[PDB]
Symmetry: C2
Subunit: 143 residues, 2 copies
């Protein structure tokens, strides 16, 4: 039932409302919904995996394939995961991370870093069950 | 007289031993890896020169911010040669990076400090606010 595949620029319009719902948690929009979907899908540094149920796009995960200077290999980095609220309790978010983790060999990843925002809690609630706590510390300067 | 400028491929030869010394402490267990790093589409490296010699660097990513449609900078690695500590060079590198924020319309600069070596943390905790997100890792191998 759950079909997971990489999103491309073709999918911006379908991706747009799903991304808009996720952003409504993280607050802020002088652009329409399609602008944010098209903007991300035209950045070659970002990739997004999508989850479809019965033809409808009902989840996504945005990830970066980044250089890893310490080992000289690469690493994946996830900052954003979201499942449509009518499709909770189905294990979809974990299915998205599982597919991403399975790309490790293809991409020469030594690791997958998962960053969970404070709100919404869904990324955090998933990651703490399926991954190890990070041992580095993080800081931010706002502009 | 610290001279701070973005590193390019020509700088790879000087950058490599500085990256190797930093990487030594970070973890362990390629002669041209610095060229791969300096030609990545997401990563960039700022270098610090004193009397012509490259003595420090910071590696950063200019990443999309899907929520806002902007960009944001992310620092995971900073290093200053051990004979050039106590001169404010690490802070100066972050200061130049903050200047690029307006040029690049960054809403924020994320600073990630590994557990070892502690120099990044000791700098970041004095110049920035603690992060309010949480992080996790799945390792392969």
């Amino acid at each position: 039932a759950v079909d997971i595949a990489l999103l491309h620029l073709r999918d911006a319009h379908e991706f747009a409302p799903l991304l808009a719902s996720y952003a409504q948690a993280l607050k802020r929009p002088r652009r329409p919904d399609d602008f944010y979907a098209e903007h991300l899908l035209q950045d070659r540094a970002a990739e997004a995996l999508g989850a479809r149920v019965d033809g409808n796009l009902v989840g996504f995960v945005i990830f970066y394939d980044l250089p890893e200077p310490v080992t000289g290999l690469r690493a994946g980095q996830v900052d954003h995961i979201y499942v449509h609220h009518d499709h909770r309790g189905k294990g979809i978010a974990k299915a998205l991370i599982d597919v991403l983790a399975d790309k490790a060999e293809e991409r020469s990843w030594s690791k997958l870093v998962l960053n969970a925002p404070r709100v919404p809690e869904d990324g955090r609630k998933l990651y703490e069950q399926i991954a190890a706590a990070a041992d580095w510390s993080s800081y931010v300067i706002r502009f």
